[PDB]
Amino acid sequence: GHMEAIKGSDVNVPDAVFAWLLDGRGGVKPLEDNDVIDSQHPCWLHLNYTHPDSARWLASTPLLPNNVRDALAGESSRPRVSRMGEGTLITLRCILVAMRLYMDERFIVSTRQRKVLALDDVVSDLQEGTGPVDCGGWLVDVCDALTDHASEFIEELHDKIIDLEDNQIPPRGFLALLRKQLIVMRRYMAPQRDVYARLASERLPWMSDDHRRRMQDIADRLGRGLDEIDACIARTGIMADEIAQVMQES
Amino acid sequence: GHMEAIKGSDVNVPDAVFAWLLDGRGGVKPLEDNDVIDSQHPCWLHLNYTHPDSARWLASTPLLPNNVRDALAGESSRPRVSRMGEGTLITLRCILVAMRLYMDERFIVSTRQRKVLALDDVVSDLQEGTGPVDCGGWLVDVCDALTDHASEFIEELHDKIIDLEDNLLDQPRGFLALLRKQLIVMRRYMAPQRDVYARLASERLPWMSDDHRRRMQDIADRLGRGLDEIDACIARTGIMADEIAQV
Ligand SMILES: [Zn+2]
Ligand SMILES: [Zn+2]
Ligand SMILES: [Zn+2]
Ligand SMILES: [Zn+2]
Ligand SMILES: [Zn+2]
Ligand SMILES: [Zn+2]
Ligand SMILES: [Zn+2]
Ligand SMILES: [Zn+2]
What we know:
homodimer, alpha+beta, Beta Polymerase, domain 2, Methane Monooxygenase Hydroxylase, Chain G, domain 1, two-stranded antiparallel ribbon, 7 helices, binds zinc ion, transport protein, alpha-beta-alpha sandwich, zinc efflux system, membrane, dimeric
C-alpha cells in the first residue's frame, strides 16, 4: 500500500476486452469510474491494442511510463521482463502469439491482438470465483496456464515422434515440420523460462514468498520442457539420417 | 489424390452407426466391400466407440495411427486439433456431448457414446444430395452445425435472464445460480473449441480449399462472438444477484 490509489475513471477504457476489479476472493466485478483502485482492489485491464480507444489510452495515459507505450502497442517480440521503477514490463509467448503486460501492486494492463488461450483459463476461474485474489497471484496463474499449454504441446510433438520411430517411412515434409516446430519452441521458451526464474527471485513487493515459490516451480517445469524439446530435436536429426538409409535400400 | 485408395473391405464395421461413401456431388451411398475409397469418393465411418466391433476395429485397424487410438476411444475431453502427419485428430463438444474424429483426404472416422444432434443436419443433407462433396466440406458443415447449436443455446440463455429481469420489474433461489453455472460451463468448453476452428482456418490442410478456410474463419469468429455474449450474460447475472439482494 506504499503506492497512491487510482480513480476508476482513469483506467475505464470503453472498448476494453476486460476491465475488472478483483474482489480479493477469487472473483471479479465490473470496473466503474467511481471505484478506487488500490492493492486490496487491483484492476485488471485487458486490451486489444488495435481497437481505437485502447490505442489512444495506451498512447496518452499518465499511468504508463513513456518508454513502455510502444511495447504494449505491440512493439515487442522476445519473452522478457523489465523494471520501470514501481512498474514491471513483461512480454510472454504462447503456442507464436504474444502477451504484453505492465503491472504494479495496484493494477495490470495487458494487451494483445490475437487471443491468448492461456488468459481464458484465468478469465474462466475469475468468472467462477476461483481465480487470483491479487496482482501477484494473477501473474503466477497466467504463467502457470501458459506453461500448461506449452507442456501439452511439447508432449504432443514427443508422441508423434515416438510414433514415427516405428510407423515405415514418414509422409513427405512431416519430419521436417516437427523439427521446425521444436526449434521454434526452443527459440522462444528458453528466454521465457528465464523470465519465470527472474520473477521467482526478484524481490517484488506485490509478489509473496509463496508466489515466488510457485513461480520457481513453473520455471523448473518449463526447464524440464526445454530438456525434452532438446532430446526430440536430436531424435529428428537421427531419424532423417536413418530415413535416408531406408530410401537407399530402395 | 496423393494418397492411395482404401479397400472399403478394410473399413467395414457391422455395428457402425453408419458407414457411408460420398459421391462427390452432395450425396452418399451405403458403403460396400468392393467399393473404392479415395479423396474424390471419401468414406464417413461413424462409430459408437462402445460397441464391440467398433472398439476392436478402433483398436486393431492399421488405418489409424496408434497415438490417436486412445482418443477415439473416449480418452480426450478438451476440444483440440492435432496433426498426426497425413491425418488430423479433432476433439469437439456440443451442448455437454463430445465428438471425436480422425480424418484425411480419403476417409473420416468419427466416434461418440451419446448422440451428437448437430450431425443430423449433415446426415440429412447427405440423405438428400445436398451434403458435403469432400472431406473438407464435411468438416466445415460439421463445425457450422455445432456452432449453430451452441449459438442457439447461448441466445436462449440470454433470453432466460431477460425474462428474469422483466419479472424483477414486476417486483427464485438458485435459479440465477444455475444459469450462471450453465454460462460458465459453456465458456469453459467454447473457448478452446474456438481455438480449434481458428486453427483449421489457419492450418494448411491439403483437403481444404481456401474457401474451406474462408468458411472456417467465419465459424471461428462466430464462436468468438458467442463467448462475448456469454461473458455479457455472466456479468449480467452478477448485477442481478444484487438487484435481488435489495429485496
Ligand atoms: Zn505498496
Ligand atoms: Zn497458450
Ligand atoms: Zn488451458
Ligand atoms: Zn522427445
Ligand atoms: Zn491427395
Ligand atoms: Zn474414387
Ligand atoms: Zn441441428
Ligand atoms: Zn446476455
